[PDB]
Write a protein that binds this ligand. Structure first.
Ligand SMILES: CCCCCCCCCCCCCCCCCC(=O)OC[C@H](COP(=O)([O-])OCC(O)COP(=O)([O-])OC[C@@H](COC(=O)CCCCCCCCCCCCCCCCC)OC(=O)CCCCCCCCCCCCCCCCC)OC(=O)CCCCCCCCCCCCCCCCC
Ligand SMILES: CCCCCCCCCCCCCCCCCC(=O)OC[C@H](COP(=O)([O-])OCC(O)COP(=O)([O-])OC[C@@H](COC(=O)CCCCCCCCCCCCCCCCC)OC(=O)CCCCCCCCCCCCCCCCC)OC(=O)CCCCCCCCCCCCCCCCC
Ligand SMILES: CCCCCCCCCCCCCCCCCC(=O)OC[C@H](COP(=O)([O-])OCC(O)COP(=O)([O-])OC[C@@H](COC(=O)CCCCCCCCCCCCCCCCC)OC(=O)CCCCCCCCCCCCCCCCC)OC(=O)CCCCCCCCCCCCCCCCC
Ligand SMILES: CCCCCCCCCCCCCCCCCC(=O)OC[C@H](COP(=O)([O-])OCC(O)COP(=O)([O-])OC[C@@H](COC(=O)CCCCCCCCCCCCCCCCC)OC(=O)CCCCCCCCCCCCCCCCC)OC(=O)CCCCCCCCCCCCCCCCC
Ligand SMILES: CCCCCCCCCCCCO[C@@H]1O[C@H](CO)[C@@H](O[C@H]2O[C@H](CO)[C@@H](O)[C@H](O)[C@H]2O)[C@H](O)[C@H]1O
Lengths: 110, 51, 90, 253, 110
C-alpha cells in the first residue's frame, strides 16, 4: 500500500464541483473505452509500483506483518465507516417498523 | 408439514441459535442473565435510552 | 540463453555501432572476447520488432534463427564434453 | 515495473525503526523515482563546474574534427552548466559501456586519467561528447538510475494539496467510524486483538526463520541457473578457441 | 520519545514475581540513595538520548509536529487507561449512593 494521502486528495477533488465542469470539458472527444483503459492503467501502475518497490524499499509503516497490516487496516476502516453506518440505519429502521429484534422473531404460533 | 419454520443463521461470525427473541406479542431477551448487564459489548452500534 | 536482444537505439544501448567491435566477458573467470559488429548485426535481421520485453528494451528473434543459434551452441558444448570430437570443423 | 540491472546477486533487505534523512534544503525534497514518476521539470537543477570536462571535450573534438560543437557548448556552459541534479551516469558504467561497445584502450585510459572515480556525467555532457541527442542521453541516464532505485532522487519541493477537502473527508471518516462500539466489542477482545497480537508476536519472533525458509528455494534456483550459464559459456568459448585455427587452410592452399 | 516496547517489557518483568525474588537478592548490600541515583540516572539517560539523537535522526513516527504528537499520545493513553477508568468507578459509586448526578444536586430548599 501507498499514497493514501493522494487518494484522499483525489476524493476531495472529485467531490469538488468545479472539477465536475473541468471533467465535462475534458470529456470532449473521448470514448468510454479510453476512460476505462486509463482507469485500469492507473490501478495497474499503483499495483506495479508496489510489486517493484517492495523488493528494496520500506515504508514508515513497515512491520513484521508487512503490507498485510495496512490492507487489514484499509478493510477495517471501510467496514467501520460504511458497513457499520448501514447497520445503524438498518437497526433504526427495524426498531421503527417491528421493534428491536423484529427481524429475528419466531413465526406466529399455530 | 403445515407448521412453519424458524429462520436459520449460522456462521463463524454470528448465529441465531444462542438465543430466542420470542413471538411478536410474547417477546423475551435473547441474552441470558449473566451477560444482560453487558449487552453493549455484544453490539456494533448502540443507541441508548432517553432519560 | 534467452531470446532477449537489446535494442540498438541509443536510448537503450548507448554507443552500439560507434565502433566496429563488441566485447564481452565470458564465464566465472570473465575471459575477454571480441566480436565483429557485422557478425552481431546479422542478428537484427531475424529480430522481430512486434515483440518487446523488459521495459520495452529487448526485442525477440524469430524462433527459427534463435533455435539454430541454440543448436550451434549445444553442438559445440557436447563436442567439448566428448572426447572423440573432430579436431576441426571442416 | 520491471527489475532493471545486470547483477546476479540475490539481494534482500532488512528494515530499521529509523527513517532516511537528507541534508536540509528549503526548495528540494528527496523521493523514490519509481514511486514519484517525476518529469524533467519536477527534477531539481543545479550548477556544475565545466573546466575539468571542457578540457577533455576540447581534446575529443580536436581528435574527431568538430570544433563548432565545443565552441557552442562552452559558450552555453560558461558560468557553470545548469542541469538536472539526479540525472547522471557514473564513470564506471560509462567505462563498461565503452569497453563492451569497442572503444580503444587508449581512449578508455584517457577517460580514466582525466576524470576522478566519483565523477558523474550528465546527459548534456554525454550528448556533446558522443554526438547524440540530449533526449536519448536523458532516457539512458533515467534507465541507469532506475537500475539502482535504492538511491533517492531530488525533486522540487511542492506544498501539500487539497488539505481543506482532506480535513473535511477525514472528519467525516471519524464521525462515521468512531461513533460505534467496535473497538469495545466482545468480538474485538476475543478474536481481533488475540489473533492479531499472536500473529504479530509470532512474526516478530520468527521474522527471519520464515524469510529464510521461504527464500531457500529461490536462492538454490538462482545458484543453479548461474552455474549452468557459466559452464555452458566456458565450454563454448574453449571449443571455439580450439576451432579458431581452421581458416588458415585456405591461405596455405 | 523512544523505546516504548522496552518500557512495556520492563513493566512486564516488574510484575513477574520471580523478578521480585531476583530484586530481593540484588538489594543485598544496597542503599536508598544508590537506588534513587540509579533511577534518576536512567531517566536522565533516556532524555539525553532524545536530546542528542533528535538533532540528526528521525523515528518511524516522525511527523510535522515531531515528538509533540508522541507525547500527546502518551498523555491520551494514560488518560483513557487510568483516569476514565477511575471516572467509571466513581460514576457507579455515586449512582449507588445518591443516584446518577447526585454530586451535582442543589442544596435542600429552606
Ligand atoms: C436439522 C439439522 C440441521 C443441521 C445444520 C445443517 C446446516 C445447513 C445445511 C448445510 C449444508 C452444507 C453446506 C456447506 C456449508 C455452508 C457454508 C456457508 O454457506 O457459509 C455460510 C456462512 C455465512 O452465512 P451468513 O448467513 O451470511 O452469516 C452471516 C454473515 O456471514 C455475516 O457477515 P459478516 O458481518 O460477519 O462479514 C463477514 C465479512 C468477512 O470479510 C473478510 O473476512 C475479509 C477480510 C479481508 C481483510 C484483508 C483484505 C486485504 C485485501 C486488500 C485488497 C487490496 C486493497 C483494496 C481495498 C478494499 C478491500 C479491502 O464478509 C465476508 O464474509 C466476505 C466473503 C466474500 C469474500 C471471500 C474472500 C475469499 C478469499 C480467499 C483467499 C484464499 C487465499 C488462500 C491463500 C493460501 C495461503 C498461501 O459462512 C460464514 O461463516 C461466513 C464467514 C466465512 C468466512 C470467510 C472468511 C474469508 C477471509 C479471507 C481472508 C484471506 C486472507 C488470507 C491471508 C493469508 C495470506 C497472507
Ligand atoms: C436533491 C436534494 C439535494 C440537493 C441539494 C444539494 C446540495 C449541494 C450543496 C453544494 C455543495 C456540494 C458539496 C461540495 C462542497 C464543496 C467542497 C469543496 O470544494 O471544498 C474544498 C475547497 C477547495 O480547497 P482544497 O481542496 O483544500 O484545495 C483545492 C484548491 O482550493 C483549488 O480549488 P479549485 O481551483 O478547484 O476551486 C476553487 C474554488 C473552491 O471553492 C469551493 O469551495 C467550491 C464551492 C462551489 C459550490 C457550488 C455549489 C453548486 C451546487 C448548488 C447550486 C448553488 C447555485 C450557485 C451555482 C454556482 C454559480 C454561482 O473557489 C475558491 O477556492 C476561491 C476562488 C473562487 C473562484 C470562483 C469559484 C466559483 C466558480 C463558479 C461556480 C462554479 C459552479 C460549477 C457548476 C456546478 C454544477 C453542478 O476548499 C473548501 O473547503 C472551501 C470551503 C468549504 C465550503 C463551505 C464553507 C463553510 C460554509 C458551510 C456552509 C454552512 C454549513 C451548512 C449549513 C447550511 C444551512 C443552509
Ligand atoms: C483516531 C485513530 C483511530 C481512527 C479510527 C479507528 C480506525 C481503526 C482502523 C485503523 C486503520 C488505519 C488505516 C491503515 C491504512 C494505512 C493508513 C496510512 O498508513 O496512511 C495514513 C496517512 C499517511 O499517508 P501516507 O500515504 O503514508 O503518506 C504520508 C505523507 O507523505 C506524510 O509523510 P510524514 O513523514 O510527514 O508523516 C507520515 C505519517 C506519520 O504517521 C505516524 O507515524 C504517526 C505519528 C505519531 C506516532 C503515534 C501515533 C498515534 C498517536 C498520535 C496520533 C494520534 C492519531 C492516531 C493516528 C493513527 C495512525 C498512526 O503521517 C501521518 O499519517 C499523520 C497521522 C497523524 C495525524 C494527526 C492528526 C491529529 C488530529 C486528531 C487529533 C489528535 C488525535 C486524537 C486522539 C486519537 C486517538 C485514537 O495519514 C493521514 O491521515 C494523511 C493525512 C492527510 C492530511 C489530512 C488533513 C489533516 C487531518 C488529520 C487526520 C488525518 C486522518 C487520520 C485520522 C486519525 C486522527 C483522528
Ligand atoms: C487500537 C488503537 C487505539 C488504541 C487505544 C486508543 C488510544 C488513543 C491514543 C493513542 C496514543 C498512542 C500512543 C503514542 C505514544 C507512542 C507509541 C509508539 O509510537 O510506540 C508504540 C509501540 C512501538 O514501540 P517503539 O518504541 O516505537 O519500537 C518499535 C520496535 O522497535 C518495533 O520496530 P518495527 O519497525 O518492527 O515496528 C514499529 C512499529 C510500527 O508501527 C506502525 O507503523 C503501524 C504499522 C501499520 C500502519 C497502520 C497503523 C494503523 C492500522 C494497523 C494497526 C492497527 C492497530 C493500531 C495501531 C495504532 C498505532 C499506529 O511497531 C508497532 O508499533 C506495532 C503496532 C501494531 C501492532 C498490531 C497489533 C495488532 C493487535 C490488535 C488487532 C489489530 C487492530 C485492531 C483494530 C484496531 C483499530 C483501532 O508499539 C507497540 O505497541 C509495541 C508492541 C510490543 C509488543 C506487545 C505484544 C503485542 C501486542 C500488540 C499490541 C501492542 C499495543 C498496540 C495497541 C494497538 C492495537 C490494539
Ligand atoms: C449445529 C450445531 C453446531 C453449531 C453450533 C452453533 C452455535 C451454538 C450456539 C451457542 C451454544 C450456547 O448457547 C447458550 O446456551 C443456550 C442456547 O440456547 C442459551 O441459554 C438460554 O436458552 C436456554 C434454553 O435451552 C435456557 O435454558 C437458558 O436459561 C437461557 O439462558 C444461551 O443464551 C446461550 O449463550
Amino acid at each position: 500500500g501507498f499514497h493514501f494521502q493522494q487518494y484522499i486528495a483525489m476524493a476531495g477533488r472529485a467531490i469538488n464541483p468545479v472539477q465536475w465542469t473541468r471533467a465535462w470539458r475534458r470529456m470532449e472527444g473521448k470514448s468510454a473505452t479510453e476512460v476505462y483503459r486509463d482507469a485500469l492503467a492507473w490501478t495497474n501502475n499503483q499495483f506495479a509500483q508496489i510489486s517493484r518497490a517492495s523488493q528494496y524499499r520500506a515504508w514508515w509503516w513497515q512491520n513484521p506483518l508487512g503490507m498485510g497490516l495496512v490492507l487489514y487496516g484499509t478493510y477495517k476502516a471501510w467496514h467501520m465507516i460504511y458497513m457499520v453506518r448501514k447497520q445503524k440505519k438498518t437497526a433504526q429502521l427495524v426498531a421503527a417498523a417491528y421493534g428491536q429484534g423484529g427481524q429475528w422473531l419466531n413465526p406466529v404460533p399455530r | 408439514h403445515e407448521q412453519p419454520y424458524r429462520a436459520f443463521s449460522l456462521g463463524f461470525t454470528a448465529n441465531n441459535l444462542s438465543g430466542n427473541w420470542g413471538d411478536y406479542i410474547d417477546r423475551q431477551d435473547n441474552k441470558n442473565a449473566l451477560m444482560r448487564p453487558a449487552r453493549m459489548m455484544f453490539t456494533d452500534v448502540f443507541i441508548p435510552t432517553t432519560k | 540463453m534467452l531470446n532477449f536482444i537489446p535494442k540498438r537505439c541509443p536510448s537503450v544501448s548507448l554507443l552500439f555501432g560507434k565502433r566496429p567491435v563488441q566485447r564481452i566477458e565470458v564465464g566465472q573467470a570473465r575471459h575477454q572476447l571480441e566480436i565483429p559488429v557485422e557478425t552481431i548485426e546479422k542478428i537484427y535481421e531475424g529480430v522481430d520488432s512486434r515483440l518487446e520485453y523488459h521495459n520495452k528494451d529487448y526485442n525477440a528473434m524469430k524462433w527459427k534463427d534463435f533455435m539454430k543459434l541454440k543448436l550451434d551452441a549445444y553442438h559445440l558444448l557436447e563436442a567439448s564434453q566428448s572426447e572423440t570430437a573432430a579436431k576441426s570443423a571442416l | 515495473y520491471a527489475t532493471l540491472g545486470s547483477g546476479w546477486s540475490f539481494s534482500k533487505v532488512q528494515y530499521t525503526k529509523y527513517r532516511i534523512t537528507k541534508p536540509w534544503t528549503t526548495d528540494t525534497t528527496f523521493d523514490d523515482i519509481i514511486l514519484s514518476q517525476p518529469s524533467k521539470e519536477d527534477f531539481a537543477k543545479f550548477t556544475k563546474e565545466a573546466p575539468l570536462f571542457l578540457r577533455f571535450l576540447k581534446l575529443v573534438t580536436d581528435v574527431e574534427g568538430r570544433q563548432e560543437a565545443f565552441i557552442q557548448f562552452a559558450k552555453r556552459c560558461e558560468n557553470g552548466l545548469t542541469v538536472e541534479k539526479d540525472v547522471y551516469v557514473t564513470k564506471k558504467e560509462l567505462v563498461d559501456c565503452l569497453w563492451k561497445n569497442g572503444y580503444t584502450d587508449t581512449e578508455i585510459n584517457a577517460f580514466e586519467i582525466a576524470f576522478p572515480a566519483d565523477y558523474k556525467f550528465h546527459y548534456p555532457e554525454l550528448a556533446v561528447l558522443f554526438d547524440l541527442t540530449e533526449e536519448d542521453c536523458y532516457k539512458y541516464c533515467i534507465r541507469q538510475r532506475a537500475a539502482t532505485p535504492e538511491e533517492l532522487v531530488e525533486l522540487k519541493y511542492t506544498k501539500p494539496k487539497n488539505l481543506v477537502s482532506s480535513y473535511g473527508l477525514c472528519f467525516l471518516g471519524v464521525w462515521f467510524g468512531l461513533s460505534n462500539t467496535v473497538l469495545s466489542n466482545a468480538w474485538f477482545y476475543s478474536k481481533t486483538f488475540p489473533f492479531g497480537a499472536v500473529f504479530y508476536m509470532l512474526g516478530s519472533y520468527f521474522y527471519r526463520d520464515i524469510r529464510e525458509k521461504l527464500w531457500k528455494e529461490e536462492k538454490s534456483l538462482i545458484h543453479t541457473a548461474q552455474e549452468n550459464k557459466n559452464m555452458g559459456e566456458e565450454s563454448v568459448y574453449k571449443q571455439m578457441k580450439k576451432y579458431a585455427t581452421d581458416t588458415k587452410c585456405l591461405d596455405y592452399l
